[PDB]
Amino acid sequence: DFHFSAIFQPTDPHHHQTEFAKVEGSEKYVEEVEVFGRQALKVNPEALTILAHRAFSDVHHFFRKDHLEGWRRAIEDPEASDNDRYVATTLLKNACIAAGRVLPSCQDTGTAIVLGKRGELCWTGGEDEKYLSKGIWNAYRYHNLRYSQTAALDMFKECNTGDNLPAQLDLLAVPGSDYEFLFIAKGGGSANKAYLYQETKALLNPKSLRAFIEEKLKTLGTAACPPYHIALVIGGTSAEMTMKTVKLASCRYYDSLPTTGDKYGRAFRDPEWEKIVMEVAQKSGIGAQFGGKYFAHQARVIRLPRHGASCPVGLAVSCSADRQILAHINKSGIYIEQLEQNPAQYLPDITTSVKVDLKRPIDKVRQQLSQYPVGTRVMLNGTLIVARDIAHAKIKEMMDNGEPLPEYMKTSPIYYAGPAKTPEGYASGSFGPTTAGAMDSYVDLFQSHGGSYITLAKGNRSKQVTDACKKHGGFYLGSIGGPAAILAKDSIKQVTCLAFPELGMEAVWKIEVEDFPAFIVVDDKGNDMYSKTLA
């Protein structure tokens, strides 16, 4: 009566539906042998370095077709809002810049994640983690990417690792003699929008599940640069298994799963509820960051088995920096997924913004902004003072010790961002905004001390920021989230380090910008352009 049933039964387990390119000459890294009557493959571990290096280079300059098609859909759909089309056009133009292979598509070049599946008879010498890490190290060291990993010297003392290591290296033991991979360059903002819910059987009916989906999708907000690939996993054998599944679902790794369950508890994709997720996302009005229909590119819904007493649920997104790449090593060499190298083909063949001069007293800038309602698009020209999470924490710590808010926090709008490395001969590397919500706890304090009256970042913010701006006559401006390469190429004209150089990308910078687009998200009157869609 025993019947083994693997939980995951893809019809395309080796991803034949994906197009791959062979690394030229790479068959020299492999050798077919036979031991004890079984076919095995000897792999020079240098192949893992070569592969990881190319993967974490390619993925920062090109996108998959299904991602690019989503931006085109947002441009061509009559039901898309004007802001939907504007945002998607900006992201497509950014992708065209990134395809130049100099600037990465986002300043957050992400955490390096490797899902590896090493066959029983695939023999590497066993030092896979080191050789993969050397390839990741190469990609981030010798290209214009960013070192984003923060080491803990103790519970609270931190430093940047300076090389974007350590990677997340999940190497699985599987049948056969090949080595198969999914590489992910996972941005922090979308990683933060991976949520775990501990639910019950009471959720598992159509009315409760739809209400749940409507409630939770809003908590994603715009803080991870939509349009999103939305992934929803219902059930699972443990919290960690649910969350791993929702990550992989968001990378479209489970697209070939069956679409029906069985009495053995196999996983399945649920197209009916994917359509419902898309309807909820579209009808939400949240839109592609600034109101409209294109909150989501597409949706993936996986139903999993569960312990009778349990119902873990996972919700996660892939952001505008949608970065994954499949690969495999076999008897013919190294193969790597082919991404779209001509994103410009997705762009169409075919008095809308307020010019804001920042080279004025900051009180003059506040006065001009006060004339306009939330949702007004502005174009910024002048100096921004750049500071995000660690710089804000350090400045608050100084003030807690009796020191004043530094003067450089009062002269210019505060841009929450951390730049990638500067290409030779460029004024700036990729330099888009970080998530605004992480700085929310500092706004009222800083404004009470005469600074941070105007902030510039991306994402909806908490009510304390709306209240602070109303109390102190402040504003929060929402940059487009994601278009870091076109901002650097076209808008950022000069970058200088002003304070805290030891923080790396998290130092305080003074930058000069031109034609920098943003929306007035929070005004000085209690208004918030997300108050209706994210209520």
* CB burial readout 89-98, b (16+ within 10 A) else e: bbbbbbbbbb
Stretch that binds a copy of itself, among 172-180, 284-292, 327-335, 519-527 (CB under 8 A): 172-180
Instruction: Tell me which residues in 104-123 interact with a copy of itself (CB under 8 A).
Output: 108, 110-111, 113, 116-121, 123
Report if residue 90 touches a copy of itself, rule: CB under 8 A. Answer: no
Tell me whether residue 47 or residue 225 sits nearer to ligand SF4 (CB atom): 225
Contacts of 15 (CB under 8 A, 6+ apart): 326
The site partner of 321 among ligand SF4, a copy of itself, none (C-beta below 5 to 8 Å per kind) is ligand SF4
Tell me whether residue 168 or residue 341 sits nearer to a copy of itself (CB atom): 168
Report if residue 190 touches ligand SF4, rule: CB under 6 A. Answer: yes
What is the chain's length?
A: 535
- Which of 99, 167, 321, 387 touches ligand SF4 (CB under 6 A)? 321
Report if residue 54 touches a copy of itself, rule: CB under 8 A. Answer: no
Report if residue 226 touches a copy of itself, rule: CB under 8 A. Answer: no
Contacts of 72 (CB under 8 A, 6+ apart): 88, 92, 346, 347
Residue 504 φ then ψ, to 5°: 70, -130
Tell me whether residue 106 or residue 326 sits nearer to ligand SF4 (CB atom): 106
Cβ of residue 240: shortest distance to ligand SF4, in angstroms? 18
Site string for a copy of itself, 418-457 (x = CB under 8 A): x---------------xx--x--xx---------------
E-assigned strands of 319-461?
324-330, 333-337, 354-357, 377-386, 414-415, 454-457
The site partner of 482 among ligand SF4, a copy of itself, none (C-beta below 5 to 8 Å per kind) is ligand SF4
Site string for ligand SF4, 224-243 (x = CB under 6 A): xx------------------
Closest CA to 398 of 449, 357, 349, 350: 449
SS3 of residue 144 by DSSP: coil
Distance between CA 330 and CA 499 in Å, rounded? Answer: 50
For the chain, report the end-to-end CA distance as a whole number of angstroms. Answer: 53
Tell me whether residue 376 or residue 434 sits nearer to a copy of itself (CB atom): 434
Instruction: Tell me which residues in 458-487 interact with ligand SF4 (CB under 6 A).
Output: 481-482
Cβ of residue 341: shortest distance to a copy of itself, in angstroms? 28
Report if residue 309 touches a copy of itself, rule: CB under 8 A. Answer: yes
SS3 of residue 207 by DSSP: helix
The whole-angstrom distance between residue 147's C-alpha and the CA centroid of its chain comes to: 15
Stretch that binds ligand SF4, among 117-125, 185-193, 292-300, 348-356 (CB under 6 A): 185-193
Report if residue 305 touches a copy of itself, rule: CB under 8 A. Answer: yes
Distance between CA 35 and CA 490 in Å, rounded? Answer: 59
Report if residue 192 touches a copy of itself, rule: CB under 8 A. Answer: yes
- Do the bridges between strand 475-479 and strand 268-269 make them parallel or antiparallel, or are there none, so unpaired? unpaired
Identify whether the C-beta of residue 14 lies closer than 8 Å to the C-beta of residue 96. Answer: no
Instruction: Tell me which residues in 409-438 interact with ligand SF4 (CB under 6 A).
Output: 432
Contacts of 183 (CB under 8 A, 6+ apart): 52, 55, 56, 59, 112, 113, 114, 115, 324, 325, 326, 327
Binding site for ligand SF4 (CB under 6 A): 106, 108, 187-190, 224-225, 319-321, 432, 481-482
